[PDB]
C-alpha cells in the first residue's frame, strides 16, 4: 500500500500497469463486518383482502397436456421462425 515508493515504481514498471490503482487485497474498502439492523420488505400477497389463494394457485392452474392427435392446401409450419443472425458487437467487433 506499506510498500514504499521505490518498490512501487519497480512493480509498476515491471508489470507496465498501475497496480496501486487497485490491489488484489483489501486494506480498508470493505463493509464494516457488523451491520445495522435491516427491515425486510413485503410481497404481493401480504394483504387481508381479495388475496384468496384459490385465484392465485399456480399449482392448480396447470391443466393436463392438451391432446393434439390421437391414433384412437394446408400450409407448412415451422416450430419457430428461423433465428435472426446476430450482429458484430458494436462494442468491439474483432479482437
Amino acid at each position: 500500500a506499506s510498500a514504499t515508493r521505490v518498490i512501487q515504481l519497480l512493480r509498476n514498471w515491471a508489470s507496465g500497469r498501475d497496480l496501486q490503482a487497485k490491489l488484489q487485497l483489501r486494506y480498508q474498502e470493505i463493509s464494516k463486518r457488523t451491520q445495522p439492523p435491516p427491515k425486510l420488505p413485503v410481497g404481493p400477497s401480504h394483504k387481508l383482502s381479495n388475496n384468496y389463494y384459490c385465484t392465485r394457485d399456480g399449482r392448480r392452474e396447470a391443466m393436463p397436456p392438451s391432446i393434439v392427435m390421437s391414433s384412437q392446401e394446408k400450409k407448412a409450419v415451422t416450430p419457430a421462425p428461423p433465428i435472426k443472425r446476430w450482429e458484430l458487437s458494436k462494442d468491439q467487433p474483432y479482437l
Binding site: 510498500a3 450482429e87 479482437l95
Partner: protein, 176 residues
C-alpha cells in the same frame, strides 16, 4: 450480439513483420512474462498465519452443530422431529418420551456428524431454534466414534458455544 475472439490478421508491412521477427528472434513476449511475475514478487503476500488469524466469516456460517436452551436453562428441543424428516442424509435420529415432569422432550438426539452435509436445513426446520450449527470448524478427531455425536455431546456444545450462537442468531433472525 456476438464478438469474434480470433479474426485479427497480421499486417504484412515492414513495420509489423519487423515487430514479429523481433518478437521471436529476441524473445520479448516471454520477457514480458518475466516482468509480470517480477512485479508480483515485489508485492505483499496474502497469506494469513494460522491459527494466529484466520479468514473472515459471516454470521450465517454453518459448522459444528449444538443444541441450545432457553434463558431458564430449559432445553429448546420439543422432539417435533422436523429436523430428522428434512435431514437430507438422514443424520438425525431422535426418540421422544413422556418426561416425568410433563414437558415430554427427546430421549435420544444423535447427529451422525460424518453423514451430515452442513446444509443448514436442520436449523431452519426447527420451530424453536433448538438445533443450530456453531461457527466452530476445528473439531477434527482421530476416531470415527468421536464424530458420531449424541444428545449429551450436543448439549455440551450448546453450553460451550453459547456466546456465538446467541450473537449470530441475534444478527440473523431478521434476515431469515
Amino acid at each position: 450480439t456476438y464478438k469474434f475472439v480470433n479474426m485479427r490478421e497480421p499486417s504484412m508491412d515492414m513495420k509489423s513483420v519487423t515487430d514479429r521477427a523481433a518478437q521471436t528472434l529476441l524473445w520479448t513476449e516471454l520477457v514480458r512474462g518475466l516482468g509480470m511475475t517480477l512485479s508480483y514478487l515485489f508485492r505483499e503476500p496474502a497469506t494469513i498465519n494460522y491459527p494466529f488469524e484466520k479468514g473472515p466469516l459471516s454470521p450465517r456460517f454453518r459448522g459444528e452443530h449444538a443444541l441450545r436452551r432457553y434463558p431458564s436453562g430449559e432445553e429448546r428441543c420439543i422432539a417435533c422431529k422436523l429436523c430428522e424428516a428434512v435431514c437430507p442424509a438422514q443424520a438425525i435420529t431422535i426418540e421422544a418420551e413422556p418426561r416425568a415432569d410433563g414437558s415430554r422432550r427427546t430421549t435420544r438426539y444423535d447427529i451422525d456428524m460424518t453423514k451430515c452435509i452442513y446444509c443448514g436445513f436442520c436449523q431452519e426446520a426447527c420451530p424453536v431454534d433448538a438445533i443450530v450449527e456453531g461457527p466452530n470448524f476445528e473439531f477434527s478427531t482421530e476416531t470415527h466414534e468421536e464424530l458420531l455425536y449424541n444428545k449429551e455431546k450436543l448439549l455440551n456444545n450448546g453450553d460451550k458455544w453459547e456466546a456465538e450462537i446467541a450473537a449470530n442468531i441475534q444478527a440473523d433472525y431478521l434476515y431469515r
